[PDB]
């Protein structure tokens, strides 16, 4: 069973930002036409070549070996912003150790005079701010006027980010991760905590209106190209980390045992965990909309702080809220820290496979972990400042889960389906597993996933809406250009590798292409 800060954090706010009900139709369309086949595809590439990352494509069409470098750039940017998520979770954890939680009431220093408590909001009869949103935007974020105003580096959040990078650095190497009975604890503790939030959320007054927001689709919103890419790349986001889950928690361990059915087990458990966490979150948001005087779609942040608003707000409606706040943010830290151990281990493994003996493995290699974590911390300092949410939402929308994931998935499916061969790949699959994949996987890699990714990419490129944080901020064109630069640094790995592999190999164009598309 796989779970991370995908299901728990990302899917609720991407669903809430895109109207709730209208998000689930592209979510399940991508889940059953793209996401499970692409997840099985990358798992078969991982099990096929007995190496890691970039050099997994020397046996699958070495012309397109830039998919490995695209995965390198995607996981690097993902590590930076996913660890600043963990910095926010740590900051909420250290603010959870007093008796009465700081987001429960608004009489503190960071609160505006316009606030009053959410319990006393329907007795006013309306431009009154909730205390959870005020705490989130003014003590955790200390949200500035825009990305043009980064303000000052929050030393609280920067030391929380340094603490969680020291936890990562002291566990990636010079240490060991969870192996034995602690695995059995950390496999069911996030599910138990999510079950506690779900049972709490459904019993809140007004959860039914939130579930009606969550499940009933708004069909006019399906014509928004933001919804389709948000859903499909939430699938590709939650499964690229699930790709690293199998690869980093055991390579070729599932060798004869059904890496088809293993992949559908973890994929369906991951998507079901997303769906359960969405039920919990939107039950809380329906409760908050009934409790306040505002709409369900306006009650909280249409942006990444939804899990830091709805889940702490539900924690404040528990018996002993300090207990549930401490354990919920410990759960967030365990989930994202295990996923960060997974992704940083994958990044180190793939870079020391990029240079097997070239200057990395022959030296100490302890210092390479420190340098990678150091520049990843310094890049994480750009989005943990006072304008840190704007840089963070840029990184989340663009750097590792935007059209870049559609680009990588379409290019993997196109290469394996056409330039490598569905039948050749199926023969390899039968060699490792024992049976060729069915017409679902075959026609998904051939037709369905390239058509879905190309259609969503072209559909947003013809019906473009800019990235907006919390429906009210409009990013400046330099910030949109920076986000597209992160996406293209993930995306332009493939064509630049195509060009340099054409120019390094001597011969005519047909001979170069023929040499580079035949596997080695």
């Amino acid at each position, epitope marked *: 069973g796989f779970v991370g800060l995908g299901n728990v954090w990302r899917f609720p706010y991407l669903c809430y930002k895109n109207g709730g009900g209208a998000f689930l139709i592209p979510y399940f369309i991508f889940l059953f036409g793209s996401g499970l086949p692409v997840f099985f595809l990358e798992v078969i590439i991982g099990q096929y070549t007995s190496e890691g990352g970039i050099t997994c494509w020397e046996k699958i069409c070495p012309l397109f070996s830039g998919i490995g470098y695209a995965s390198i750039v995607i996981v690097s940017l993902l590590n930076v912003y996913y660890i600043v998520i963990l910095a926010w979770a740590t900051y909420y954890l250290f603010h959870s150790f007093q008796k009465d939680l700081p987001w429960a009431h608004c009489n503190h220093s960071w609160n505006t005079p316009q606030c009053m408590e959410d319990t006393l909001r329907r007795n006013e009869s309306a431009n009154f701010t909730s205390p959870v949103i005020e705490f989130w935007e003014r003590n955790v974020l200390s949200l500035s006027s825009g990305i043009d105003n980064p303000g000052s580096l929050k030393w609280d959040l920067a030391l929380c980010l340094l603490l969680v990078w020291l936890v990562c650095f002291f566990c990636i190497w010079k240490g060991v991760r969870s192996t034995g009975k602690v695995v059995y604890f950390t496999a069911t503790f996030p599910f138990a905590m999510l079950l506690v939030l779900l049972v709490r959320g459904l019993t809140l007054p007004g959860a039914g209106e939130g579930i009606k927001f969550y499940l009933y689709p708004d069909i006019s919103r399906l014509g928004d190209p933001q919804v389709w890419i948000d859903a499909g790349t939430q699938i590709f986001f939650s499964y690229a980390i699930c790709l690293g889950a199998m690869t980093s928690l055991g390579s070729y361990n599932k060798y004869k045992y059904n890496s088809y059915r293993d992949c559908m087990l973890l994929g369906c458990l991951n998507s079901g965990t997303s769906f359960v966490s969405g039920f919990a979150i939107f039950s809380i948001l329906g409760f908050m909309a009934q409790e306040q005087g505002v709409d369900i779609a306006d009650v909280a942040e249409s942006g990444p702080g939804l899990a830091f608003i709805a889940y702490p707000k539900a924690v404040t409606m528990m018996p002993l809220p300090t207990f549930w706040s401490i354990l919920f943010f410990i759960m967030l830290l365990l989930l994202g820290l295990d996923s960060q151990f997974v992704e940083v281990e994958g990044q180190i493994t793939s870079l020391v496979d990029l240079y097997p003996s070239f200057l990395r493995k022959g030296y100490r290699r302890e210092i390479f972990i420190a340098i990678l974590c150091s520049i990843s911390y310094l890049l994480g300092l750009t989005m943990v400042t006072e304008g840190g949410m704007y840089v963070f939402q840029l990184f989340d929308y663009y750097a590792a889960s935007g059209v870049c994931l559609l680009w990588v998935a379409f290019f993997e499916c196109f290469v394996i389906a056409w330039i490598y061969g569905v*039948n050749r790949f199926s023969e390899d699959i039968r060699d490792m597993i024992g049976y060729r994949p069915g017409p679902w996987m075959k026609y998904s890699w051939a037709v369905i996933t390239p058509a879905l990714c190309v259609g969503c990419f072209v559909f947003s490129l013809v019906k473009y809406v800019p990235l907006t944080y919390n429906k009210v901020y409009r990013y400046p064109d330099w910030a949109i250009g920076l986000g597209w630069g992160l996406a293209l640094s993930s995306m332009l790995c493939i064509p630049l590798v195509i060009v340099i592999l054409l120019c390094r190999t001597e011969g005519p164009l047909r001979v170069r292409i023929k040499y580079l598309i035949t596997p080695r």
Partner: antibody
Amino acid sequence: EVQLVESGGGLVKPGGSLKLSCAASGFTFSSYAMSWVRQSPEKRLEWVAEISSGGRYIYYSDTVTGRFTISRDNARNILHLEMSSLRSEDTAMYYCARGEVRQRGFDYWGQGTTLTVS
Amino acid sequence: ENVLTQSPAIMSTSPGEKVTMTCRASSSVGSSYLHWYQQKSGASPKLWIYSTSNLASGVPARFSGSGSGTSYSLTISSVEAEDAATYYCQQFSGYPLTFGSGTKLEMK
């Protein structure tokens, strides 16, 4: 109806060679891996050689690893088995078997060709 | 090789009697890869039970299979005159694919 017909079996000298030909029809031959299973006159079954769906993954048993070669012609839907250095403990009744899914076994077999070494 | 020592070949059982036959493997088979074949007198083998429990097409429900790992069993609920044949158990996981020995069911 899936049918597998084997041919090219007969008496050969020891240390010689003979070419079997499993001809199959009624199904697509490029999508199913194929194996050769022999049966001794003492009536024990021994798997000889499996070729994959495209011929890129070829396996042999420990008895005939270095002297038996199995080949497929996808175009003519025929499965072959080139032999070499046929020793005395190789007289058998050679069957062609459609083994593609590893969890469903050899679901369709064929007739036999009596390879006789004397 | 993964030598599958099977039950002794000469078993003689009266019709209508519940019978069983074992298939011990030297290595460990993954229990989705061990199959049973029924070869009649002078005829070709045919797939009879696959993945140690499932029934092949044209096989009556009176046949059943059980076991996992090392010990695998074929069970007939009641024997009729069309059940007089030799049964071979066969792992198909490890790349030197091996069949079992004989288990020839003769009448009385």
